[PDB]
Structures are given as structure tokens and as C-alpha cells.
Subunit: 204 residues, 3 copies
């Protein structure tokens, strides 16, 4: 080789011509006498609800995060020291972001006291894809949320309009507790409940 | 002449032939077309809304609009019942918060209503700028999607009677949102004063 | 002497003069300040809250606090009406869920109220550790931001009368949140028993 071009360089100090390769020190280095990249970049992974769409090399929020549906089939338990019963219900469930929504269709139940508790046992009854743990609230604050239910008290053929205030109050080993603090009331033998929804924070 | 070399450059005089080569990291680079080239150049991913890349500061973030996007719908609130139906001019405030759509009703005075009935909002037209009809479509068919109470005053021959109305988001069909009034307390009346109220439902558009 | 040269290295014997040169990929590398450098070194982006980089596992995630952040406000709930106003000592639970702020009221006994009025919460002081006054600012000026019902019992000369109160989040001004009580059912009374209730509004802080 007669002469050389950059990056290649020849330095002829002390009557001895020596060839050397020139690189950007920030970009490269020599490791085990070979040109190596300095800091090879490892691409991060993503935790749900963030996901990598490998097909289009795109990071996105999972679709299910905005909406995940399900159903719970079981017995709605009403609890009061002087009165308690079980009614067969099917409620719709929807996970919207960090919230769990419960949707009750209309229902006819036995009579209730001026106040009381409703208990939903998620230990069993959940539709496919759902685990009991998926219904656990993300806080122990009481109440997590309150809503009103519109009811009709049935007493000797007449239907009497009233309301019931409902609060999500507790979750214990898969048992969700919805307190009925009260509302308007009259003596009755049976209750007609219009549809209603209740939701609470849930980050599972 | 070039007397000697330094790494990466190496001279192996193997098989009676003094030959020069350039030593590189086998996994970082590979020669192709007789030029040093990067073995696996990394393509950086793109981002789907609400994730966005702030190119100015090279920062990935959640879009601001995702947390809050406001709007208005101007149109006629339709009340529907077989024995009574009417249209009232309203302007509703709308707000997209995350994967929820909130509807905000200001106070209103309407004609009388039956013990139960439907409210229909036609989003086909009336939305403010930036909003499309499709933007109001719920993300589920569950009925009801959400329920709330509206506080009302029934006007009947001069006296104002306080009552409530339960409202549920029940259906969306080709831009028509249906809000069912299942019932609540009631009395015979000439007109209804509605206090303000909000209702929201899941919406991932 | 060097007999031969291996790629990347190549020699061009153009006009009886052998010129040694380094062969590199035109798009992968370049020559700056007479040295091999990288053509477009890729800078990895940073992340704005609620997105965060877990450096320990090199994983991008949504911060846990985004789904749930709790707190408390201790202060005096102010009831306001031109003909009646009072202050009651309360402790409210707060929870930030995504882009929402939830306020949780436990049961309470207060003085009597008018047919309508305002509740004011002064967040300027009283917030638990980690919380700033600005953290309670709504993300919209829409009125109402949200409405809910509170179940009450009016105490009127020994008898307890069940009724409801409609509550709307209406305004936030320099740390003072205003919750309007538009009305609801009513009767003359001496004191009010309030059942627990929650109210939430959009908040992207
Ligand atoms: C409309 C009706 O039959 N009402 C009965 C009630 O019947 C049950 C069920 O109706 C509802 C209801 O309208 O109250 C529907 C609703 O989705 C359910 N609510 C929830 C939250 O899931 C409730 C609820 O589970 C119960 O009322 C609580 O006690 O029930 C009917 O759809 C169901 O109908 C079957 C018919 O009886 C049968 O002839 C037909 O072939 O098949 C359908 C099912 O596909 O029957 C349910 C029986 O419980 O029952 C209550 C007493 O439990 C009262 O008598 C209502 O008057
Ligand atoms: C206060 C009042 O005028 N009330 C009338 C009502 O007037 C309409 C509107 O008022 C409100 C209301 O307070 O009832 C405001 C509210 O934001 C609206 N609510 C919703 C959910 O959109 C309602 C609602 O649209 C109607 O009640 C439907 O019945 O209405 C007034 O702000 C508006 O005022 C105009 C004046 O009439 C006009 O002189 C002035 O120059 O401009 C203002 C602003 O454009 O008028 C509205 C329509 O009349 O109207 C109802 C009957 O529709 C009753 O008569 C109320 O008593
Ligand atoms: C005694 C009682 O339970 N009810 C009193 C009320 O007493 C206050 C407080 O109770 C509650 C209540 O249930 O009414 C609890 C509740 O969480 C509070 N609500 C909110 C939203 O913060 C309310 C609210 O502060 C008031 O109703 C406003 O008027 O209060 C009691 O737990 C508390 O108990 C203390 C003992 O009295 C004291 O001897 C002991 O040393 O410490 C405990 C705990 O600090 O007392 C509270 C006093 O206000 O008070 C109201 C009048 O303010 C009525 O008399 C209720 O009947």
C-alpha cells in the first residue's frame, strides 16, 4: 500500500511508519483488540396496559383496558339481624380503565328492613376470563362509591315509589358488601327494583 | 511504506503471505458488499393514541386530550312515550375523560311527562367542532351502561312538587343515544322543572 | 511489506499508486473529523408521568399511583346561604383514580339547611401529606361537572323524615371547591342526618 485515506492514518515518528484506524471514541472503542460499539441499546419491554404490537412495531394501550365485559351469576344476599334472604341474579360487569362497573337489571325481591346489607360472593359465579381477585377494590375507604336505586314497595297490591341509597363498603376474600344506608320507606311484603349501576375503583 | 500496524488492524504473515485485516466485533458489525455494516440496526417503535412522541423533547407521553376533551351538542332533546312526546331545545356540555363520555345537563323547563319514558339525543348533527357522531358511541351494549338520578319539580296548578327521576343510558343506534326514565316518584302535573344533572357512560373512541 | 488486504479494507491501484481505504456502509456510518463515526446515533426517549421507565427491569409502565392515590382533607365544611350559614368539622377521604378525583363523605350530623344552598370546601389548607391544593383543581369549567344524590333525614321535633339532596360540583376558585345543593325533597327541620355519599369530578393533576 503506497498511501492511505481517513479513517486510516499513517504516523512515521522515529523513522517508523505506523498504520492506525481512527474512530469516534463516543461511538466506538476497542475491546479484545476489535472495533466494538460503546453502549449497544437494549429496547425496553412493556407492562400491561402498555403493549408492543410487534407486527407494526408500535407501542399502544391494550384495547381491553378501556373495556372488558363479563357476568356474575349467583345469589344476591340480603342481610339484616331480623331478616335475611337470597335471590338469584345475573349482573353484568365491565372493567373500564381502573374502574369496575356492576350493572343490575330490573328485579323483584322479598321485603327489606329500613336499612341493611347486600353481599355478592365472587368466590364462584364469574364468567370465563374472570377471577375472583379481579373484583377487588383498589382502596379500603368507606364508602368507595354511593348510588341510588329506584324502587317500588309492594304492599297489598299497591306499588309505592321510593329510593334506596347504596354504598360500596367492603371487600373481604371475594365477598363484596353493598350497604343500604336507608332512603324513603313504607311497610311492604315485596320490592320491585328498577335497573341500576354502581362502580368502584379497581386496578386489577 | 507502512512498517507496522496497531489494532484493530493486524498483519498475519500466515502461509508465506503477509496479509492485513481489520478486526471488528462479530455481533455488532458484519461486512456485506465488502463494507463494514451494522449487524441489526434498531428500528424505534411508533406510538398509537393516547400514547404520543413529543419529538421536540424526545419524550413519550399520554396525550393531554385523553384526560379531558370538551364539547357541546346543540339540538332537540326528544321525549318519547306512546301517549305523549315532545321536543325541547337544549345545549348539553360534553366531556371525554379517559374512556368515559360525560353528558352535562343544565337546568331546564319542559312539558309534562308520563310515569316512565325515553329521552333521545340525536348526535347525527349538532356536535361542536372537533366532534364526530361516532365519538359518542358506547364501548358496550350492556343495558344499562349507567344510571343516575335527576331532581325535578312537578308543576301542578301553581304548586311545585319535589320528586326524582331515575335515568339510565340504555342504547345507541346510528348516532341516536337513548336514555330511559324507568320511573321514580310522580304526581299529575302540567310542566317539569329539571335541576342540573350529569350522566356518563363507557366510550373508547 | 503487506502483500494483500481483506474487506472492509480495499486498495485502488489507480495511476500506478495503490491507495488503502476503509470500506463502510454509506447509511450506517460516516466520517467526521477524519474518523469513523455513526450516522444518526439513536437517542432513546424519556417518559412523562403517568408513563415511567422501570430502570431495574428496563420496562416501560403506567405508574401505580395513577390508578389509585389516597388522601384526606381535614377542615370545615362550609354551608352557605344568604339567610343561613354554618361550619361543620369534617374529614373527607380523597382518591385520585386515573383522571378523576373522588370525594368520600362519611355519615354526618349538621345544623338545619335551606331548600337550596352551597357547600364549600377550602383546600388551601387541610390536605394530608403528599397533597397540594392544586391537586384538587378540576380539568374543566363546565357546570355541573358531576351531580349525585345524598340521602338525608330531617329532624323536626323528634320525628326523623327521609329525603334526598341533589349535589353538583359547580366551581373551583383558588382552592375553594363549591358543591351546589340545587334542592330535592324538603320539610321544616332543626337538624340534618346525612348518610354517607361520594362525589367525583374530572381532574388531571
Ligand atoms: C319478568 C319476570 O319473570 N319477573 C319475575 C322474575 O322472573 C325472573 C326473570 O326476570 C327478572 C325480573 O324481571 O325481575 C329479570 C332480571 O334480569 C333479573 N335481574 C337480575 C339482576 O339478573 C331478575 C332477578 O334475578 C329476579 O327477579 C330476582 O328475584 O329477574 C325472568 O327473566 C325469568 O324468566 C324465565 C321465565 O320464567 C320462563 O318462563 C322462560 O321460559 O324463561 C325465562 C328465562 O329465560 O324468570 C326469573 C325467575 O326468577 O322472578 C321474580 C321472583 O324471583 C318475580 O316473580 C318476577 O315477577
Ligand atoms: C331562564 C329561562 O329563560 N328559562 C326558560 C327557558 O329559556 C331557555 C334558556 O334557559 C334555560 C333554563 O334556565 O331553563 C338554560 C339552560 O341552559 C337550558 N338547558 C339545557 C339542558 O340546555 C334550558 C333548556 O334549553 C330549556 O329550558 C328547554 O325548555 O333553558 C335561556 O337561557 C334562553 O335565554 C335566551 C332568552 O330567551 C333571550 O331573550 C335572550 O336574548 O337570549 C337568551 C340566550 O339565548 O332561552 C331558552 C329558550 O327559551 O325556556 C323554557 C321553555 O323552553 C322555559 O320558558 C324557561 O322558563
Ligand atoms: C358522636 C357521633 O358519632 N356523632 C356525633 C358527631 O360526632 C363526631 C364524630 O362522628 C361523626 C358522625 O357520625 O356524625 C363521624 C363522621 O365521620 C364525621 N363525618 C365526616 C364526613 O367527617 C362526622 C362530622 O364530623 C359531624 O357530624 C359534623 O357535625 O362526625 C365522632 O366520631 C367524634 O367522636 C369523638 C368523641 O366525641 C370524643 O369524645 C373522642 O375523644 O374522640 C372521638 C373521635 O375524635 O366526635 C365528632 C364530634 O363532632 O358530632 C355531631 C355534631 O358535630 C353530632 O353530635 C353527632 O351525633
Amino acid at each position: 500500500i503506497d498511501s492511505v485515506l481517513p479513517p486510516l492514518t499513517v504516523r512515521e515518528a522515529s523513522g517508523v511508519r505506523t498504520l492506525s484506524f481512527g474512530y469516534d471514541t463516543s461511538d466506538f472503542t476497542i475491546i479484545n483488540s476489535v472495533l466494538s460499539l460503546r453502549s449497544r441499546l437494549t429496547l425496553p419491554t412493556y407492562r400491561y396496559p402498555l403493549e408492543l404490537d410487534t407486527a407494526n412495531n408500535r407501542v399502544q394501550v391494550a384495547d381491553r383496558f378501556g373495556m372488558r365485559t363479563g357476568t356474575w351469576t349467583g345469589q344476591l344476599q340480603y342481610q339484616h339481624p331480623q331478616l335475611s334472604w337470597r335471590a338469584n341474579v345475573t349482573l353484568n360487569l365491565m372493567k373500564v380503565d381502573d374502574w369496575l362497573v356492576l350493572s343490575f337489571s330490573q328485579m323483584t325481591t322479598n321485603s327489606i328492613m329500613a336499612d341493611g346489607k347486600f353481599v355478592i360472593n365472587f368466590v364462584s359465579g364469574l364468567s370465563s376470563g374472570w377471577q375472583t381477585g379481579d373484583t377487588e377494590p383498589s382502596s379500603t375507604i368507606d364508602p368507595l362509591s354511593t348510588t341510588f336505586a329506584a324502587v317500588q314497595f309492594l304492599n297489598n297490591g299497591q306499588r309505592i315509589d321510593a329510593f334506596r341509597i347504596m354504598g360500596v363498603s367492603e371487600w373481604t376474600d371475594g365477598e363484596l358488601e353493598i350497604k343500604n344506608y336507608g332512603g324513603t320507606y313504607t311497610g311492604h311484603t315485596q320490592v320491585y327494583w328498577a335497573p341500576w349501576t354502581i362502580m368502584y375503583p379497581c386496578n386489577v
